[PDB]
Amino acid sequence: MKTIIINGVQFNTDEDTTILKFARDNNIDISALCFLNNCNNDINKCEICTVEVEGTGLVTACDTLIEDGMIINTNSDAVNEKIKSRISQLLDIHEFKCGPCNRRENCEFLKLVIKYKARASKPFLPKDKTEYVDERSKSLTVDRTKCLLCGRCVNACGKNTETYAMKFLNKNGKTIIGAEDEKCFDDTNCLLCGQCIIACPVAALSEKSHMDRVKNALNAPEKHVIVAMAPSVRASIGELFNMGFGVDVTGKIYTALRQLGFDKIFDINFGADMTIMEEATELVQRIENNGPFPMFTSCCPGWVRQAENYYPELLNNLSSAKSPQQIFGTASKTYYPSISGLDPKNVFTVTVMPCTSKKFEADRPQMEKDGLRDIDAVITTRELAKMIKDAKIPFAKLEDSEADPAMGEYSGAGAIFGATGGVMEAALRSAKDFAENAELEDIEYKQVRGLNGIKEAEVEINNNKYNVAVINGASNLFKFMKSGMINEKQYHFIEVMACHGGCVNGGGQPHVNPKDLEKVDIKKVRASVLYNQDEHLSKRKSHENTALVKMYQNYFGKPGEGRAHEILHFKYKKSAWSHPQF
Ligand code: SF4
Ligand code: SF4
Ligand code: SF4
Ligand code: SF4
Ligand code: FES
Ligand SMILES: [Cl-]
Ligand SMILES: [Cl-]
Ligand SMILES: [Mg+2]
Ligand SMILES: [Mg+2]
């Protein structure tokens, strides 16, 4: 047994762990910065986690194991001086102007500067930020005047995607982070998943803003602005309004969106039910046609980019159904005018997404018809929160309201899209009913749920056994393919999400402090809201959505045929690179 003494207090433990972990486990305060995802910045350690081990000297707590008889002071004058000195050095390369900053309310660096009363040896005040800023991407932005070179983004990219699209670069003899060859991220193997943003302690990495698109549309007299939120937003955005984790704020969002002046309140969960209508039908068609198997989901634009960039031979195997976002958008410019009298060109469709890659998806040149974009703007969960706060809307105090039903109703199947395994489960509910011409009672596919990276199941459909898999995170797609798992059996239907946990852990989601991530399983807690909705909804199958059924009966016809097939689908092709202008 190890006996260790920390700030005078004796501890008896068998644990083999770091000083930082043990201290955090035992409510002892130790600061940290570059340590995240069980890695610190091995080159250029930040040393913010410095503690004193009597007899040894100053050590970095985040990668120093506890040892029997250690006497540790986390708070000696020597320790605080070192840490304060490290923060001072960072201030020397940091434009410290928190007033207008988009991380002002939850910046890890600001909190450290305050805690240690750090001051720059010389304030960093660049007169021209243009050379520090990269806004070329459809999804990501970089502001290097904020960058601490902590490496958290580089490490998070590697672990979450294994693309290493985010790199340390030598630019004119000075270190920066950025994409390969300092290119626009979009032009590299990057998935635009934004996991790098989520890992950033400061405002250096952000989403490409669509807030001006939205505000200009809202203010244009002739525009009719639709807004529709993704499943995950209602399980997440309350975090930014002091409501804590795992709170369902669906009704509040609807009210807030009306107060922001949006002209129609719909819901992307309605779009998810549409995706299932088409994709479940397509699965049943492929069963009839002996393929092409496997069918892959196509609702995650991070995964679509991964396939385009690494596995172009799989593109024809993707489901042709548009994603919940784009399929909704398509309907919003066609069906919705048909039931409203609106001039289609005056409809402006806005989504709220937990995702940065959705911005790239919405701006794909061919995601339009007759000159009308499926989706005109995509704002992240974070962007919506800022919009609500700017408008002085008292979010946490709002009464609940309802969505406009025509493209706002949703089933429990659509509701769970935000969790890894969600589209798989939702699809199977409809596909098995369709194939067996039945209304089955047993609809919960718990085998495809949860945080395991690769999840498989055998599903009986119309008295044959089919093999399905759920790939949970872009790194696990690479594992699945590179390890040859893909060739161990015939797979028939495979879900792929780029973000581990699914969209509840997307790149547009609220940041979470590393200390809170230690206490809260954010992927599980956000997803729980969605599964809870599913359990409590009367309709738990996409094809039982009454507003959806009306829409097909009155406008689209039958899924996978006719008008539905013509405009609610999208196929990806391998082709020579071009600027999107072409
Ligand atoms: S990144 Fe943090 S410390 Fe820097 S200006 Fe923004 S809020 Fe202030
Ligand atoms: S968006 Fe995703 S793939 Fe691209 S650099 Fe960031 S973490 Fe890596
Ligand atoms: S962009 Fe953010 S996470 Fe990446 S090195 Fe800079 S401060 Fe760290
Ligand atoms: S898993 Fe969801 S949030 Fe992540 S890239 Fe895919 S669609 Fe976006
Ligand atoms: S947090 Fe330990 S070296 Fe950075
Ligand atoms: Cl309506
Ligand atoms: Cl979602
Ligand atoms: Mg290390
Ligand atoms: Mg208006």
Pocket residue to mutate for ligand 2, from 180, 183, 192, 308, most atoms within 8 A of Cβ: 192
| Cβ partners under 8 Å of residue 418, min gap 6 | 230, 231, 232, 235, 354, 502, 503, 504, 526, 527, 530
What CATH number should be reported for the domain holding residue 92? 3.10.20.740
Annotated ligand binding at 49? The verdict is yes
237: number of CA atoms within 13 Å, CB side?
31
Strand partners, 53: 57, 72
* Dihedral in degrees, nearest 10, Cα atoms 538, 541, 545, 548: 170
> Cα(125)–Cα(123) distance, rounded to whole angstroms?
6
Domain stops at, among 109, 124, 139:
124
- Tokens, residue 171: 């630019």
Question: Tokens 């016809």 appear where?
Answer: 557
3-state secondary structure 128-151: CCHHHEECCCCCEEEECCCCCCCC
Helix (H) or strand (E) holding 273: helix 268-288
Residues 145 and 247 in one domain: no
Strand partners, 272: none
| Cβ partners under 8 Å of residue 485, min gap 6 | 454, 479
Determination technique used: X-ray
> Cα(212)–Cα(160) distance, rounded to whole angstroms?
31
> Cα(143)–Cα(146) distance, rounded to whole angstroms?
6
Residues 405 and 274 in one domain: yes
Q: Tell me phi and psi for residue 207, to 5 degrees.
A: -80, 150
Question: Tokens 């409501």 appear where?
Answer: 243
| Cβ partners under 8 Å of residue 336, min gap 6 | 226, 342, 347, 406, 407
Q: Taking Cα atoms as reference points, which of 542, 468, 562 lies closest to residue 277? A: 542
Domain stops at, among 85, 105, 124:
124
Pocket residue to mutate for ligand 1, from 33, 87, 92, 96, most atoms within 8 A of Cβ: 96
Helix (H) or strand (E) holding 197: helix 195-199
Q: Is 341 left (phi over 0), alpha (psi -120 to 50) or beta?
A: left
Domain stops at, among 74, 95, 124:
124
Neighbours of 576 (CB within 10 A): 4
* Residues counted in the chain: 582
> Cα(368)–Cα(375) distance, rounded to whole angstroms?
8
The domain tally of the chain equals 3
Which residues have any ligand 1 atom within 6 Å of their CB? 94, 96-98, 101, 103-104, 107, 109-110, 146, 202-203
Separation in Å, CA 207 to CA 41, 314, 386, 412, 417: 24, 29, 13, 30, 22
What CATH number should be reported for the domain holding residue 146? 3.30.70.20
| Cβ partners under 8 Å of residue 398, min gap 6 | 251, 252, 255, 256, 259
3-state SS, residue 57: strand
Residues 226 and 203 in one domain: no
Question: Tokens 């980019």 appear where?
Answer: 305
106 Cα: distance to centroid of ligand 1 (angstroms) = 9
Annotated ligand binding at 184? The verdict is no
568 Cα: distance to centroid of ligand 2 (angstroms) = 29
Q: Taking Cα atoms as reference points, which of 138, 259, 232, 256 lies closest to residue 190? A: 138
Cα angle value 498/503/506 (rounded, 5°): 75
Residues 322 and 435 in one domain: yes
273 Cα: distance to centroid of ligand 9 (angstroms) = 28
| Reported resolution, Å | 1.6
- Tokens, residue 434: 């369709």
* Helix axis angle, 422-436 to 268-288, nearest 10°: 50
Contact 417, 444 (CB under 8 A): no
Q: Taking Cα atoms as reference points, which of 30, 62, 24, 64 lies closest to residue 46? A: 62
Cα 78–chain centre separation: 41
Annotated ligand binding at 299? The verdict is no
Residues 343 and 196 in one domain: no
Contact 214, 390 (CB under 8 A): no
380 Cα: distance to centroid of ligand 3 (angstroms) = 20
Residues 285 and 229 in one domain: yes
Residues 129 and 83 in one domain: no
Contact 447, 293 (CB under 8 A): no
Helix (H) or strand (E) holding 357: helix 357-362
| Contacts within 8 Å (CB) and 24+ apart, 482-490 | 485/454, 490/293, 490/294
Residues 34 and 173 in one domain: no
Helix (H) or strand (E) holding 330: helix 324-332
Annotated ligand binding at 34? The verdict is yes
* Dihedral in degrees, nearest 10, Cα atoms 254, 260, 264, 268: -50
Range of the domain at 2: 1-124
In terms of DSSP bridges, do strands 224-229 and 347-353 run parallel, antiparallel, or are they unpaired?
A: parallel
496 Cα: distance to centroid of ligand 4 (angstroms) = 9
Residues 270 and 389 in one domain: yes
Residues 396 and 347 in one domain: yes
Separation in Å, CA 392 to CA 48, 175, 216, 264, 385: 37, 40, 19, 21, 11
Residues 146 and 248 in one domain: no
Strand partners, 6: 9, 72
Residues 40 and 53 in one domain: yes
